[PDB]
């Protein structure tokens, strides 16, 4: 006898209890689809790091294991939600190709970290790191069992659980030009084999070309997921995800040459997945508003090792790493005057999404709870990069700008430019909505304690 | 506003930002997809947890007590069970019993030690460490408290979860005699820091209707939640836990779903089951055992569910959706030892086996089995031994069959018996789909090398 069962995915048809042939084909297509779609979210963090490594080796063409200097707007433009204040020193490499690598870090006041491909923190660097700003030598060891017994004396031995690692550093001193010329030249990476040191690799300077490490879309996304899997070992927590991608044509040790049917499912997974990433990130259902009555929320909810008590933070890391890159102890600092804190808002005081054609205003109260500096940077929602405007000015930082008499500071966001507020203006873009992070570099007590707070952005012109 | 159509509905955006409605729909579809995939993930553990719930609340045996299953009524509730070898099975939660010893006598048995997800911890008896000579197995809880417990004289088993399973089968043809000798000498016994508790004898299964098969709708989710509570969280399952969180399922918290969560879970159970059937019956991860036939070796999963670069999520869900337990021995390549299982759900025409029709299976002479062979009919819906008016769900070589001149045997399946073949007949129910397992107890080299082969089930 036949029987039909309606469902969210369509009518399920059975013949003599067994599913019909067509229903099985459909279900296996639905299963592969759902699996690919959820894998999309699972892959957000690694996609970012992998795509950065591709740019480094293929576009910038830096030596495998070589660091890069990012400072100018054109250099930083490709970095997801980067700031346009602190000089960056960044590098990504595959430990399997480089072998044990050393990171000779100079004595200076920097903020940084060591990350694995999925962006878990292996160690902070400089001030809030083992060296405490005094400098030191960090040996990064490949997860290969070969190097299991590698523990050389005189180094901060770091052992990532994957091959594709990442290192990032920031110059915190306001005398940018002076410090870079004093610290960067001394920052270097260096091979280490058996018991002999190799040639030191200097920090190269990033070229002036169009680029970005943001996760790609369509099938490009899967090709890179496939790449992530090929360059790294398979970790226990990811064994089921691997099982779920198998029939989509993605497997470790096998080329990615998907069939048409696999492509069709994958294209859909990328589309629906992207929408879900947006949804999970802007909703941020696992956290709450930093300040009641506002849409401001601490942007970083993920743990350093991505471990909660009974689960690994798939959603928390999916949200934060969808719009940003890296995390560290400092980035979640509760130490007065050290590290940084990040608050984000995607809407105005009416809960409406911020769009580049309207005029907005953010009232920054006096005595901002920050020791080094504070800033507001605008990013485009679509790419989550510093919005490219006519002015060539992505943000506003504690610098040369109009300051109210009560010591408050008003920031304006709009297409054109408010009169008298030319120093405190942010040029948006017609119907190209955006958002922004309010950076706290060297956050004090009143920011942690919620003694000092701000309101959401208010709409001005229609 | 922009709109992008998709396989899950039209996606709407306001200035690039997803609309409020779209975000809600995405989170909803996200939870649905996750719960649907978790359903498949939990197939194995569900079968065992449900059995332990029956042992505790329906049979009401002690936590840690074994059960004797032998009559059709006793085994009826066991997923794809045989009606040939007496069973001695039990399931318990180590955290509740504490270290538990399995006092195994000397005998020709086939059994295993499984964890909640049905990974093999060890084989028992003949193909096990005691080699049929008998012995004592000490199953230790995963807690860090007993992390050093390693007393001499026992076979120390270290499960990774709390809910474990123990199964044994009497292989001897003299069932009435061997049962009386062996089962009375089988017991489980608590071990607490050196001292032994009282021995727990095997209890006969009460005459009542039961089944450990996974439940449907929200009943399945309540049990998945229970599995979570009763066992620690393992690394490989950390993301499944993350995905279940917003559906109202977390360890350490009660299961009290919101109206919205229940709607998602019900659909997930419905779509998850259909996917379970599809994954199982299609078996795209394997192929026919004998070329040109629908027969396939029913077991593809590895003892520890570990393949080279992934854990066998699909192979696990396929075989455990239609069966229970695994061991080195149901995958034996050792001649005359262990068992092997072949399955078919379709006739030679590729059509689903349905009870309203009459079929015939031609079993060649010299079946490659040193102990016995059989064909058991199971219903597709519950995957339990077929319930017919005849009270006979199978045909085994132990029975009184009408052998052929050349020694071959003709088995018939139908709602009505075939002229002079009642002894080689298994009654089926019209309109009800069925499938069958062909068991090889004591498989010979002719089975492994494919030298001996059998055709598909013919219609009419
Ligand atoms: Mg930054
Ligand atoms: Mg930092
Ligand atoms: Mg059996
Ligand atoms: Mg066995």
Domains of chain B: 1-29 (2.20.25.10), 31-60+209-285 (1.10.3360.10), 61-208 (2.60.40.1610), 286-460 (2.60.120.600)
Q: How far is the CA of A24 from the centre of ligand 3 (A)?
A: 27
Measured N-to-C along each axis, helices B313-322 and B259-282 cross at an angle, to the nearest 10 degrees, of 90
Q: CB-hemisphere CA count at 13 Å for B402?
A: 12
**CB < 8 Å & 24+ apart, contacts of A394-402:** A394/A73, A394/A84, A395/A83, A395/A84, A395/A85, A395/A426, A395/A436, A396/A424, A396/A425, A396/A426, A397/A85, A397/A373, A397/A439, A398/A368, A398/A370, A398/A373, A398/A374, A399/A373
CB atoms inside a 10 Å sphere around CB B290: 15
| Residues of chain A contacting B271 with CB distance shorter than 8 Å | 7-9, 12, 27, 30
**Alpha-carbon distance values, A323 to A79, A318, A326 (Å):** 10, 9, 10
Among A237, A382, A432, select the one facing B238 at the smallest CB separation.
A237
List, as one string, the DSSP characters of A326-378.
---SGGG--STTSSEEEEEE-BBTTSPBP-TTSEEEEEE-SS-S-SSEEEEEE
CB atoms inside a 10 Å sphere around CB B259: 6
Query: Cβ neighbours of residue A297 under 8 Å, at least 6 residues apart?
Result: A284, A287, A288, A289, A290, A343, A344, A345
**Alpha-carbon distance values, B27 to A38, A280, A317, A381, B30 (Å):** 12, 7, 16, 19, 5
β-bridge pairing B369-379 and B394-396: antiparallel
Q: Which of B20, B90, B103 is nearest to B52 (CA)?
A: B90
Measured in angstroms, the CA of B381 and the nearest CA of chain A are apart by 6
Q: Which of A86, A177, A179, A81 is nearest to A374 (CA)?
A: A86
Intra-chain end-to-end CA distance of chain B, in Å: 62
Q: What is the 3 state secondary structure string of chain B?
A: CEEECCECECEEEECCEECHHHHHHHHHHHHHHHHHHHHHHCHHHHHHHHHHHHHHHHCCCCCCCCEEECCHHHHCCCCCCCCCCCEEEEEEEHHHHCCEEEEECCCCEEEEEECCCCCEEEEEECCCCCCCCCEEEEECCCCHHHCCCCCCCCEEECCCCCEEEEEEEECCCCHHHHHHHHHHHCEEEEEECCEECCCEECEECCCCCCCCCCCCHHHHHHHHHHHHHHCCCCHHHHHHHHHHHCCCCCCCCCCCCCHHHHHHHHHHHHHHHHHHHHHHHHCCCCCCCCCCCCCEECCCCCCCCECCCCECHHHHHHHHHHCCCCCHHHCCCCCCCCEEEEEECEECCCCECECCCCEEEEECCCCCEEEEEEEEEEECCCCCECCCCCCCCEEECCCCCCCCCCCCEEEEEECCCCCCCHHHEEECCCCCEEEEEEEEEEECHHHHCCCCCCCCEEEC
Q: Do A433 and B17 touch (CB under 8 A)?
A: yes
Q: How would you class B238 by CB atoms within 10 Å of its CB: exposed for 0-12, middle for 13-18, buried for 19 or more?
A: buried
Instruction: Report how this structure was experimentally obtained.
Output: X-ray
A207 secondary structure, DSSP code? -
Tell whether B308 is within 8 A of chain A (Cβ).
Answer: yes
Q: Are B174 and B190 in contact (CB under 8 A)?
A: no
A145 secondary structure, DSSP code? G
Query: Cβ neighbours of residue A81 under 8 Å, at least 6 residues apart?
Result: A323, A324, A325, A377, A379, A384, A385, A386, A437
Any bridge partners for residue B397, and if so which?
none
Q: By 3-state DSSP, what share of chain A in percent is helix, strand and coil, each rounded to 5?
A: 30, 25, 45
d(CA B147, CA B150): 9
List, as one string, the DSSP characters of A231-279.
HSPPPGGGHHHHHHHHTTT--TTS-----HHHHHHHHHHHHHHHHHHHH
Q: Closest chain A residue to B352 measured between Cα atoms?
A: A18
**CB < 8 Å & 24+ apart, contacts of B5-13:** B6/A268, B6/A271, B6/A272, B6/A275, B7/A33, B7/A268, B7/A272, B8/A272, B11/A271, B11/A272, B11/A275
**Alpha-carbon distance values, A329 to A110, A114, B151 (Å):** 13, 11, 44
**Alpha-carbon distance values, B297 to B30, B329, B408, B409 (Å):** 35, 13, 22, 21
Among A239, A279, A431, select the one facing B18 at the smallest CB separation.
A279
d(CA B209, CA B76): 8
Exposure string over A250-282, b if 16+ CB within 10 A, otherwise e: bbbeeebebeeebeebbbbbbbbbbbbbbbbbb
Any bridge partners for residue A273, and if so which?
none
CA torsion sign, B56 to B59 to B64 to B66? negative
Measured in angstroms, the CA of A77 and the nearest CA of chain B are apart by 20
Tell whether B209 is within 8 A of chain A (Cβ).
Answer: no
Which residues between 252 and 281 in chain A have a beta carbon less than 8 angstroms from any beta carbon of chain B?
Answer: 252-253, 268, 271-272, 275-276, 278-280
R_g of chain B computed on alpha carbons:
24
H or E segment at A425? strand A425-427
Q: Are A440 and A369 in contact (CB under 8 A)?
A: yes
Q: Closest chain B residue to A281 measured between Cα atoms?
A: B23
Which residues between 85 and 144 in chain A have a beta carbon less than 8 angstroms from any beta carbon of chain B?
Answer: none
Query: Cβ neighbours of residue A90 under 8 Å, at least 6 residues apart?
Result: A67, A68, A70, A166, A167, A168, A169
3-state secondary structure of A166: strand
Q: How far is CA B31 from the centre of its chain?
A: 28
Q: Closest chain B residue to A238 measured between Cα atoms?
A: B236
Phi, psi (rounded to 5 degrees) for B349: -85, -5
DSSP alpha helix (H) spans, A100-217: 176-183
β-bridge pairing A164-171 and A88-94: antiparallel
Q: Closest chain B residue to A272 measured between Cα atoms?
A: B6
Tell whether B192 is within 8 A of chain A (Cβ).
Answer: no
d(CA B209, CA B78): 11
Q: Are A330 and A323 in contact (CB under 8 A)?
A: no
Resolution (A): 2.1
Among B7, B239, B271, select the one facing A314 at the smallest CB separation.
B239
Measured in angstroms, the CA of A231 and the nearest CA of chain B are apart by 13
Dihedral, B328, B332, B334, B335 alpha carbons, nearest 10: 150
Among A7, A234, A268, select the one facing B7 at the smallest CB separation.
A268
Dihedral, B389, B395, B401, B405 alpha carbons, nearest 10: 130
């Amino acid at each position: 006898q036949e029987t039909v069962v309606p469902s969210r995915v369509g009518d399920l048809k059975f013949e003599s209890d067994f599913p019909t042939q067509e229903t099985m084909k459909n279900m296996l297509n639905e299963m592969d689809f759902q699996r690919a779609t959820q894998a999309y979210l699972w892959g957000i963090p690694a996609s970012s790091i992998m795509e950065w490594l591709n740019v480094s080796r293929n576009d910038f063409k830096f030596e495998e294991g070589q660091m890069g200097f990012f400072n100018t707007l054109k250099q930083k433009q490709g970095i997801i939600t980067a700031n346009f204040t602190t000089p960056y020193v960044i590098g990504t490499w595959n430990l399997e190709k480089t072998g044990p690598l050393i990171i000779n870090l100079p004595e200076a006041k920097m903020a940084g970290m060591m990350l694995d491909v999925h962006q878990r923190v292996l160690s902070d660097l400089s001030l809030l790191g083992p060296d405490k700003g005094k400098g030191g030598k960090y040996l990064i060891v490949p997860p290969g069992e070969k190097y299991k017994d590698l523990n050389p004396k005189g180094y901060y031995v770091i052992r990532p659980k994957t091959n594709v690692v990442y290192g990032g550093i920031r110059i915190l001193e306001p005398d940018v030009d002076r410090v870079v010329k004093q610290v960067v030249p001394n920052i270097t990476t260096q091979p280490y084999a058996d018991g002999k040191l190799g040639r030191k690799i200097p920090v190269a300077q990033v070229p002036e070309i169009d680029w970005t490490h943001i996760p790609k879309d369509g099938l490009e996304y899967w090709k890179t997921i496939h790449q992530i899997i090929q360059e790294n070992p398979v970790e226990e927590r990811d064994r089921f995800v691997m099982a779920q991608l198998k029939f989509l044509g993605i497997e470790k040790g096998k080329p990615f040459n998907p069939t048409e049917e696999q492509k069709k499912i994958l294209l859909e997974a990328s589309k629906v997945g992207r929408a879900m990433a947006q949804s999970n990130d802007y909703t941020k259902r696992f956290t709450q508003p930093y300040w009641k009555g506002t849409n401001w929320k601490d942007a970083i909810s993920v743990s350093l090792d991505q471990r909660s008590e009974n689960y690994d933070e798939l959603d928390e890391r999916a949200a934060w790493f969808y719009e940003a890159i890296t995390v560290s102890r400092g980035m979640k600092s509760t130490i007065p005057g050290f590290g940084q804190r990040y608050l984000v808002t995607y809407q105005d005081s009416d809960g409406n999404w911020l769009s580049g054609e309207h005029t907005y205003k953010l009232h920054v109260p006096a005595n901002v709870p920050a020791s080094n500096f504070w800033s507001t940077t605008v990013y485009d929602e679509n790419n989550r990069l510093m919005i490219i405007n006519d002015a060539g000015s992505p943000d506003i930082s504690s610098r040369k700008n109009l300051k109210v008499n009560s010591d408050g500071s008003i920031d304006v966001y709009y297409g054109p430019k408010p009169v008298k507020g030319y120093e405190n203006n942010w040029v948006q873009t017609n119907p190209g909505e955006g958002w922004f992070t309010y950076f706290r570099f060297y956050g004090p007590t009143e920011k942690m304690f919620d003694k000092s707070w701000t309101m959401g952005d208010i709409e001005l012109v229609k």
